């Protein structure tokens, strides 16, 4: 650990389409086990239906491309990289140290 | 939809080891290593110019 340093931040929620099925001819959202999956939906009546952990299912939304499942973590922490979506609020959680720094010899 | 993107120039992490550090010189001070041998006694010695 020399003087460089790099930041470590909360990354923000990453989507999956793979969490999104059609069940009975309604989309059916199915968290991967004990992680939440904030649903975001734009059928009749916006969901915005965060706290599920099991399997939920919505028929208000008759197509999977109108709902968006985003995975959320929360809990381990990811370089402030430029290809990541923001989380929201403050998100600086730390500093990285970095090796291979440039040194003198012979 | 919208993305906000801000960037920003910091320091490199090498910058502690590669540097150039730019000066301003003056009013040189000259100093002299000096074998004196007077009367076979012989010293080295630093003087001031
Ligand atoms: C599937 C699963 O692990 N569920 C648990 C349950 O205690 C609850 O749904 C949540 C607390 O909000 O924590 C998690
Ligand atoms: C001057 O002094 C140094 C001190 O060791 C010595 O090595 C050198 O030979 C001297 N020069 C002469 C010309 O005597």
């Not at chain 1, 990354?11 to 939440?36: A, I, Q």
């Not at chain 1, 919505?58 to 499942?69: D, L, N, V």
């Not at chain 2, 490199?12 to 004196?36: G, M, W």
Request: proline share 3%.
């Amino acid at each position: 650990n020399r003087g460089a340093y790099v930041e470590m931040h909360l990354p923000g929620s990453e989507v999956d389409s793979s969490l999104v099925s059609l069940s009975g001819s309604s989309v059916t959202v199915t968290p991967p086990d004990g992680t939440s999956a904030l649903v975001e939906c734009e059928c009749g009546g916006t969901k915005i239906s965060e706290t599920i952990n099991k399997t939920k299912q919505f028929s208000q939304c008759t197509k999977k491309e109108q709902c968006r499942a985003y995975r959320l973590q929360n809990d381990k922490w990811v370089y402030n990289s430029d290809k990541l979506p923001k989380a929201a609020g403050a998100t600086l959680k730390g500093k990285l140290h970095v090796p291979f720094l440039l040194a003198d010899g012979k | 939809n919208t993305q906000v993107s801000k960037a920003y120039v910091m320091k490199s992490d090498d910058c502690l080891a590669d540097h150039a550090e730019a000066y301003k010189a003056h009013t040189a001070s000259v100093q002299a290593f000096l074998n004196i041998t007077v009367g076979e006694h012989s010293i080295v010695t630093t003087v001031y110019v």
